[PDB]
Symmetry: none
Subunit: 243 residues, 6 copies
């Protein structure tokens, strides 16, 4: 058997942990190991509300080339205190239904996805919708956000470690779980990177995988990026690219 | 390493999405692609419209006709239980009972809450309890895997067969979700592997652009077309890589 | 693609199901099959009767004896915590705290709930917290994987050691389920991979026909026999395909 | 201090042990003694052979005939549910539902497991659910008290009415215990006071010397005789001292 | 105006040292002595230091013999010594399928039903309770008989051969005092007898140092209540018994 | 007989249902009725929103301000613990210990399992342990009684304070039942009387007809109105008859 992602062209959507612009990124290792041509759209500080824009740029510049897409986003939504929100809104409706006898109008509760940039769930609904609309025939995979600790970049950018809830009373857990739940909600594969990478900066001995123990226990260093890449390599073995 | 399912004989249990007769030769089934790609001989028992209450029968028919040669079994069922408004129900019933127990002192009857699985075909969970029981009973030494139901949209097959899309609850106040999650839950409840097909296939007819994987945008957004079947087959190929057949 | 675990040195932490001495030579253990099939050198520390509170000790002994050569670690523990009625407990305690925060404006002291892991051996989650912490502190750059406990039925080892099947809650009012689920939950809580062995092995002694995978149909439906160990090993072989060893 | 039930009007719901016609005037009933001792006017609705499924009916008749007069209500029922092999059943059914909630942050729909009372005459717990609901609906501002059934022994009334003593389970595998405990449990489940008559009366026909409190040692160790009724009445007199009538 | 139902009645008191008139001699005024004073209740006391539930029949028999025609009610305050002496809890019944005649509308016929039989043995605590309540009801079937649960207890040291750890420890057969308290409470429904949960209602817990004011010796005896404890017990009993008649 | 609580001075510990500030003069509280009926002087410490973790503070304030005057104490707390999703936890922790024991022969060290109460405010049972310890410590010679929380329904107090009715589990997966039962269990665990107010009041807002006892059917089916407070007071009056104050 051969690796299904070997020699494929892949679009990478995300934040600074994916952003090309001191640290060699995971997609660069995959390029070397599996010959995967990378189309990187991840940008520093971006959140799930930026998924549609990144997807659109990918479509515009490489629509006829890209084979698969990986979405690694969400840690910034947590940091920016983006309210989790709701997946759907629901209400009674009347609809034609038939199961053995003449069809007739019946009352059935109907749900409608909440399409808003105001909430995390809303952003995920909008993002996945756009991804499927633009790339309906491609392999699209979501990766959950990594564990994170303290990060201090100046007097206007101070991020407490993950033992703290953010400004809207949520732990990073809610931002990780929403992505995992999106798998069944929208019908899309999810790689639980948060867990499978085995990287947790809350355990100081594992800070060997992060940028600087003194002020940045959020961004992985090259060593962490390589462990992420190797993890992704075997986790992707379970998903085809060419159908 | 070689694919653990290559050259094996597999029983396929399910409904129309597995039925070789679904729309005749106008839809090539996933097990057909697997046969071509991995040399997997298919023993197909899926039949259009069948529900989880039909798993025991299909399992027994598989046992009777190919019990001495089948290597593994895939169960892809449940979307019709949703459409037919089968109440979810509960997994077990509980009650304080006495049982022989010892942890340091002389053994004796002690009272502990005991759970007993609900064996009834009146509920979805009951049907699953009965179905998995029959599967493990007839094929105790085989690799048996459950596949979760696919996302689904509108389906109209005449005035007596009209199925609203999945944004609507069915007749017993449940969304398709309940039937998908019950199968996932069965993994730990019964000790059986589950492939979350609902998610990994990446096929959602609720997004019209992906209707390229379903039969007819006008009246059938429930049954995958050949293109969808091939995507399902390719998905299965790599998802099955994580499970052995020959122990 | 070559198996990532091929030819690696692995540490096996656990209980009797891992212990080389379980029924002596009457049972060939899963790690022995892996040694033969994948050339994986085993450093086994599992010991009969041990619980999650023994994980740090085993991890430390592994570090002391093979720290410079071990490549990966598998933790297969918890069924004894269930039998010994160890309360599940809580993962964290929490309270409002003042912390420096800044998102666009001058940093200021703000009020935010802060959680702290419960580090006690009095509870299951407490033991898991302590265990995973020690594992990560000792082997921060290694591949460490947790395996969930297998389904289990009755066992009668002597006048003072009789263990009811899994349809019964233990002495602290919990089903085996809680001990399986807590390990799965540890995946996201601590950032560690988990192989849901409880489900993927497809071995459930509660279904009599599957007792072919356990040691004694009359007195021990808890410990797998060689046939069960091999099914376990083959399952692990393909489940581990999704995880790298050499980073 | 004066007895809170003195001079009050009370509705008595139950079976033969309450029915004034039980063996005609050969037996003086407990409410009769209470009428004499405390001036409690009785509105009796208990009828021989009635079960908990008849509570709503008796309550409605009481309401219809003395609604504007009755001060309190006593429900002494269940022994016939035992003799008629009425399955205990379940108190509630549960499932995940969406509900508005807020504890510090903006209110929103959250998922929480919700329980719903099982309202059915097919089970004992179901009957209790329906009965108490009706009692509270009809007399929301009254003192309503439940009394657990008395211990019981053999009862033979012809070749077609033979009731084994309480050392035997009934036709649905339950001891009288289950029907007593269900009532005690209803105290907290529904929010209603319960007098454990089963214990406090001190009357157990299973001990032959105490058959002095039952109708006939030869064929009726189920129905109390006048002596037993008086002991019950006196017990009730002091047990009711702990509950107000006029609020 | 309601009168206390136990006023002027004659009561038999069955139990152990906490009931024994000889407990520390005249250094302790017992609960039944206070009830005699407050309610004019004549006490027939049979409690003896160190006795267990296996001694209930003997005490009941002696009560019947000496005061059978005088006694109106009976209180049984026993069990703390069963805990201290590591008496196994045991089982209430044994069960087996039996054939029995039953009829519910149609001609009676033999049917299979599980039948239970109480375990009558002095080898276990539950067995002793079965034997004890049976004898109490056989001897005094028309009397008010009430069971009292054992009191919370702490350390006690009565010499080189009599040392009792506090209730935070299991006894010699792996049981906490809890098991001996609960078995009595359960007997209420099992046998049809009222039980006053003295263990809780007295509000006396020697495990809380500040409440040792109710026990005899802070340094050597946190098991036996002192007069102050006996009075709180009696006063508690006075109002708890208000709920039970004596004269039927 | 005279009421044992007549003319006594009582401390009332609890939450808003006890707090005199609850809706101010719009609600006359239970202790106010008891003052008028039995001449009981009230020393009220209950405060809106408080939980069992506040019992030690309220007990100490009562001690400080009325320690030489108070005769008895009632503790009516817990409903907010439910609302605030406080985990139930465990009563004790256990460990094998060596202790001096003698039963007929020369004393010596033996191995016995020893339990230690959990003294943490992180769990409900821990809070009860801490609270009852404080109560008995400061008032060792007083009559102290616990009252179980009342049945409750929905409450909506603004955008950030919305409480679902009791048919829903709280934020930590527990029904109100758990917080009611733990208090009942405290009786034997700590040796303290418990009045099961949850049942004896007969007040259940889940039965709409009984909402006559609660503040507002529209937004407050949690707090009893004056009519509810009076029924509660009347219930307490006769329930307290079984407990002495002056020993």
């Amino acid at each position: 058997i051969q690796h299904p992602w070997q020699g494929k062209k892949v679009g990478y959507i995300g934040d600074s942990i994916t952003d090309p612009n001191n640290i060699k990124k995971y997609w660069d290792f995959l390029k070397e190991w599996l010959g995967i041509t990378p189309f990187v759209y991840g940008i520093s500080g971006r959140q799930w509300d930026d998924v549609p824009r990144q997807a659109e740029k990918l479509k515009k510049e490489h629509g006829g080339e890209v084979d698969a897409i990986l979405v690694f986003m969400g840690t910034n939504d947590y940091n920016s205190s983006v309210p989790i929100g709701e997946w759907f809104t629901e209400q009674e409706e009347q609809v034609l239904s038939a199961h053995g006898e003449m069809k007739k109008m019946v009352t059935r509760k109907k749900r409608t996805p909440v399409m808003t940039q105001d909430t995390y769930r809303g952003r995920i609904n909008i993002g996945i919708t756009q991804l499927k609309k633009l790339f309906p025939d491609k392999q699209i995979v979501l990766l959950t956000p990594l564990h994170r600790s303290l990060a201090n970049f100046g007097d206007k950018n101070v991020q407490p470690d993950e033992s703290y809830q953010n400004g809207c009373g949520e732990y990073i857990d809610a931002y990780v779980q929403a992505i995992k739940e999106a798998g069944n909600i929208w019908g899309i594969p999810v790689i639980d990177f948060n867990a499978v990478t085995g990287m947790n900066p809350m355990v100081e001995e594992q800070l060997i995988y992060f940028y600087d123990a003194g002020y940045d226990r959020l961004h992985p260093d090259t060593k962490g990026q390589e462990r992420m890449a190797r993890t992704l390599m075997y986790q992707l073995l379970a998903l085809p690219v060419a159908f």
